[PDB]
Design an enzyme around this catalytic site. Structure first.
Site: not given
Ligand code: HEM
Ligand code: HEM
Lengths: 137, 138
Positions: A87, A129
């Protein structure tokens, strides 16, 4: 997120969407050139990242509205091997693209508000997730 | 959205509300059913409301962390016939209970921050459940 932050997001997203093609192409170009290690995870070139972040941003005040989308994207990310530590990297290359596009409008406060927004958004996919990876076992 | 003083009040006070849990839960359901007999039918007595809101509130800065639970509660709410307009009423009765326990500590800013928090929390459920109601018709 503080309101000036939200205000910047709400006000500028439409400018970024206007330049979508540019942010999208610059993003993927730099992502892959600067981080060849993620190349394996992916005419069929990916295109949807930057616009999806814009769309979420547009919904920054009510992220639960975009859960049906977030949930399905999560399924593909967990299938591909996407990790939490990926990320920040995607965030950096996205901000760099937003930066090139805004040009002289690219205020540090603005850039800083975008950093903050991406974080918040990324935080949602990261937790969803994590939860899906746990369900798999 | 939610400001820091508010998040601050929530984070600081939840532990006090959880200590008085039994009292908030029982005052809450009693008032809910006595003041809004219309919701009775939708519901060996329920007990998990107030403590679940406190738990979410405790997770106020990272609501996505509690989605696996929210999702499952959503399923039971849509099965039962829970509507968006029901939320403000559950909020009113939860707030009156919080107020009773906080007693003299029940400041207006504190009650206001709880009101705001409940709002944020409820909006998550309202939105997921709307999405689940649609999903049932396609
Ligand atoms: C909040 C940030 C992100 C957003 C909004 C996002 C968005 C998306 C979307 C919309 C898709 C395609 C889904 C489909 O139509 O099935 C996708 C796929 C994908 N994303 Fe993300 N993503 C994000 C973060 C990341 C990160 C951190 C990585 C790590 C490299 C990544 C890698 C991938 C890969 C590998 C796929 C499937 C690609 C393929 O096989 O072509 N994403 N993402
Ligand atoms: C954010 C606020 C809410 C929270 C945290 C919440 C929480 C819960 C929880 C944890 C359960 C039990 C789930 C189970 O163990 O399967 C439940 C069930 C239920 N809730 Fe809520 N709820 C909320 C709002 C409301 C509203 C607005 C109403 C409408 C009056 C309502 C009515 C119901 C009913 C009818 C059930 C099922 C009871 C049964 O099984 O007989 N809830 N709720």
């Amino acid at each position: 997120l503080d309101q000036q932050t939200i205000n910047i997001i709400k006000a500028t997203v439409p400018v970024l969407k206007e330049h979508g093609v540019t942010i999208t192409t610059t993003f993927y170009k730099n992502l892959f050139a600067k981080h060849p290690e993620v190349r394996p995870l992916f005419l069929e070139q990916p295109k949807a990242l930057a616009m999806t972040v814009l769309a979420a941003a547009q919904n920054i005040e009510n992220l639960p509205a975009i859960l049906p989308a977030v949930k399905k994207i999560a399924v593909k990310h967990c299938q591909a091997g996407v990790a939490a530590a990926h990320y920040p990297i995607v965030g950096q290359e996205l901000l760099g693209a937003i930066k090139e596009v805004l040009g002289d409008a690219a205020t540090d406060d603005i850039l800083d508000a975008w950093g903050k927004a991406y974080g918040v958004i990324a935080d949602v996919f990261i937790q969803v997730e994590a939860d899906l990876y746990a369900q798999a076992v």
